[PDB]
Design a protein around this motif. Structure first.
Motif, PDB file in Angstrom:
ATOM      1  N   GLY A 169       9.813  13.879   0.787  1.00  0.00           N
ATOM      2  CA  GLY A 169       9.070  12.681   1.161  1.00  0.00           C
ATOM      3  C   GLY A 169       8.562  11.944  -0.055  1.00  0.00           C
ATOM      4  N   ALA A 170       8.223  12.702  -1.112  1.00  0.00           N
ATOM      5  CA  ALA A 170       7.875  12.124  -2.425  1.00  0.00           C
ATOM      6  C   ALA A 170       9.089  11.390  -3.053  1.00  0.00           C
ATOM      7  N   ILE A 188       6.314  -1.156   2.067  1.00  0.00           N
ATOM      8  CA  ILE A 188       5.225  -0.663   1.241  1.00  0.00           C
ATOM      9  C   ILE A 188       3.875  -1.129   1.773  1.00  0.00           C
ATOM     10  N   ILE A 195       2.908  10.902   2.356  1.00  0.00           N
ATOM     11  CA  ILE A 195       4.107  11.404   1.730  1.00  0.00           C
ATOM     12  C   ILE A 195       4.670  12.595   2.515  1.00  0.00           C
ATOM     13  N   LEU A 229      11.697  10.149  -1.323  1.00  0.00           N
ATOM     14  CA  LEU A 229      11.819   8.976  -0.495  1.00  0.00           C
ATOM     15  C   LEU A 229      10.994   7.826  -1.048  1.00  0.00           C
ATOM     16  N   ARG A 230       9.716   8.130  -1.323  1.00  0.00           N
ATOM     17  CA  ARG A 230       8.713   7.167  -1.765  1.00  0.00           C
ATOM     18  C   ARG A 230       8.915   6.672  -3.196  1.00  0.00           C
ATOM     19  N   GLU A 273      -2.734   9.567   0.176  1.00  0.00           N
ATOM     20  CA  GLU A 273      -1.381   9.274  -0.215  1.00  0.00           C
ATOM     21  C   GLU A 273      -0.511  10.515   0.014  1.00  0.00           C
ATOM     22  N   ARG A 315      11.433  -4.334   0.983  1.00  0.00           N
ATOM     23  CA  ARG A 315      10.699  -3.384   0.163  1.00  0.00           C
ATOM     24  C   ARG A 315       9.188  -3.615   0.294  1.00  0.00           C
ATOM     25  N   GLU A 349      22.384   6.642  -3.584  1.00  0.00           N
ATOM     26  CA  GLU A 349      21.816   5.329  -3.810  1.00  0.00           C
ATOM     27  C   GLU A 349      21.610   4.595  -2.483  1.00  0.00           C
ATOM     28  N   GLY A 352      12.614   3.100   4.870  1.00  0.00           N
ATOM     29  CA  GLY A 352      12.268   3.513   3.522  1.00  0.00           C
ATOM     30  C   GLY A 352      13.372   4.304   2.825  1.00  0.00           C
ATOM     31  N   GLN A 353      13.977   5.272   3.528  1.00  0.00           N
ATOM     32  CA  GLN A 353      15.053   6.102   2.982  1.00  0.00           C
ATOM     33  C   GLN A 353      16.324   5.331   2.744  1.00  0.00           C
ATOM     34  N   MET A 360      16.382   2.231   1.759  1.00  0.00           N
ATOM     35  CA  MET A 360      16.046   1.052   0.948  1.00  0.00           C
ATOM     36  C   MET A 360      17.214   0.462   0.113  1.00  0.00           C
ATOM     37  N   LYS A 408      11.940   6.451  -4.637  1.00  0.00           N
ATOM     38  CA  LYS A 408      13.088   5.527  -4.485  1.00  0.00           C
ATOM     39  C   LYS A 408      12.760   4.157  -3.811  1.00  0.00           C
ATOM     40  N   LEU A 409      11.906   4.170  -2.793  1.00  0.00           N
ATOM     41  CA  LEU A 409      11.301   2.964  -2.254  1.00  0.00           C
ATOM     42  C   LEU A 409      10.438   2.152  -3.267  1.00  0.00           C
ATOM     43  N   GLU A 410       9.540   2.810  -3.993  1.00  0.00           N
ATOM     44  CA  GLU A 410       8.650   2.103  -4.920  1.00  0.00           C
ATOM     45  C   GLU A 410       9.257   1.851  -6.304  1.00  0.00           C
ATOM     46  N   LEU A 411      10.395   2.496  -6.575  1.00  0.00           N
ATOM     47  CA  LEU A 411      11.087   2.437  -7.871  1.00  0.00           C
ATOM     48  C   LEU A 411      10.192   2.855  -9.024  1.00  0.00           C
ATOM     49  N   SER A 471       1.706  12.128  -7.495  1.00  0.00           N
ATOM     50  CA  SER A 471       0.718  12.182  -6.434  1.00  0.00           C
ATOM     51  C   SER A 471       0.942  13.397  -5.541  1.00  0.00           C
ATOM     52  N   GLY A 479       7.909  13.103   5.416  1.00  0.00           N
ATOM     53  CA  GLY A 479       8.795  14.261   5.165  1.00  0.00           C
ATOM     54  C   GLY A 479       8.914  15.239   6.337  1.00  0.00           C
ATOM     55  N   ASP A 529       5.299   7.508  -9.479  1.00  0.00           N
ATOM     56  CA  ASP A 529       3.941   7.737  -8.980  1.00  0.00           C
ATOM     57  C   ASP A 529       3.822   8.651  -7.757  1.00  0.00           C
ATOM     58  N   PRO A 530       4.670   8.449  -6.710  1.00  0.00           N
ATOM     59  CA  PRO A 530       4.596   9.347  -5.542  1.00  0.00           C
ATOM     60  C   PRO A 530       4.945  10.797  -5.860  1.00  0.00           C
TER      61      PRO A 530
END
Lengths: 189, 191
Positions: free
Chosen positions: B165-166, A121, A159, B168-169, A155, A117, B19, A106-107, A109, B171-174, B181, A163, B177-178
């Motif tokens: 971690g937010a 997910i 998250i 991270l998420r 969620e 991706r 990136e 994930g990190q 990506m 950048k993964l989901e583009l 959240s 972390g 939202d995370p």
């Protein structure tokens, strides 16, 4: 016989410890002690191996969540604590050098193939659905108050938990897992 | 532009490692993006590892200024300064379509593939952020925004664990939202 399993094993050890970007097919073959021809019998290339490793991690990790989340001898919040405790025991086996394959990928990506991706997910979402169900059950018995949203809370759990694993692997110690879980635990009654 | 060689190197370094990450990015790619000759890279840095540490020092400096804007703003209540920071950081991430994350989080996650010098350097930066945030939380207590119940240091650590971690998420989901959240759920810790 054990050619396929040794490749998967070598792949899971290297990707939980380093990540995809750091590891080539040759490192993998040395660690697996498996000929190059076996590699190419099972996978087309590194990217295809990467996806096979995601899927294999998802199957394994699902059994870990089965053991904790489906233990009906435990109240629902106690199941979440068993999970984080068992996850920490698993990390302690290798002195916290190995984290989550999904969080590692994930990190990175930005340097992975596009296929990755949606597969990463999908796995995160499967875990959140399972945790949401656990959280609805905590509400049904007053372990979690009615004014919380189980899906939003699930969620946030994932998250922060990824972390925490990032930090534990960086610091090579359990303390970040404990900080995360002790503070997150205050969402419950 | 000869007098710009060092800034170009740092710029290209920050862009490429926020990136992608350290393991993904070679020196030749940095040189090509910076448009500086190899002899200029070795003038300043002895190798990729010395370069990487310089990037962490650069990121620490520039990031401290973004925290200064939020955390040192005396027109805001303590918790509103924390919400400003997360709002700003999201605005920053939104500029490049959520393709760029935290340098410290990116490198932290790939620690197994890094020279061991990086461990203390990465941990040092995070602990700085945590110390500034706990101080914010102590001021939130001293004015009644946070309950006397909470440990400001534990909460500061949980904030930085969760926020990385937010990112991270995101950048993964583009997408942001995370981020929303995470902060929505973390905000419950406050009065």
């Amino acid at each position: 016989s054990l050619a396929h399993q040794s490749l998967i094993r070598a792949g899971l050890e290297h990707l939980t410890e380093k990540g995809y970007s750091s590891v080539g097919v040759d490192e993998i073959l040395k660690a697996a002690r498996v000929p190059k021809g076996s590699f190419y019998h099972y996978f087309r290339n590194k990217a295809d191996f990467g996806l096979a490793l995601i899927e294999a991690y998802d199957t394994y990790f699902a059994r870990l969540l089965d053991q904790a989340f489906l233990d009906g001898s435990l109240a629902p919040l106690a199941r979440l604590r068993l999970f984080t405790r068992m996850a920490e025991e698993g990390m302690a086996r290798h002195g916290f050098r190995r984290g989550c394959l999904v969080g590692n990928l994930g990190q990175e990506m930005g340097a992975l193939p596009d296929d990755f991706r949606a597969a990463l997910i999908g796995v995160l979402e499967t875990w959140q659905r399972r945790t949401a169900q656990l959280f609805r059950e905590a509400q049904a018995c007053g372990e979690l108050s009615a004014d919380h949203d189980p899906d939003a809370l699930a969620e946030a759990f994932w998250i922060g938990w990824e972390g925490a694993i990032l930090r534990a692997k960086l610091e090579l110690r359990p303390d970040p897992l404990h900080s995360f879980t002790r503070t997150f635990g205050r969402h419950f009654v």
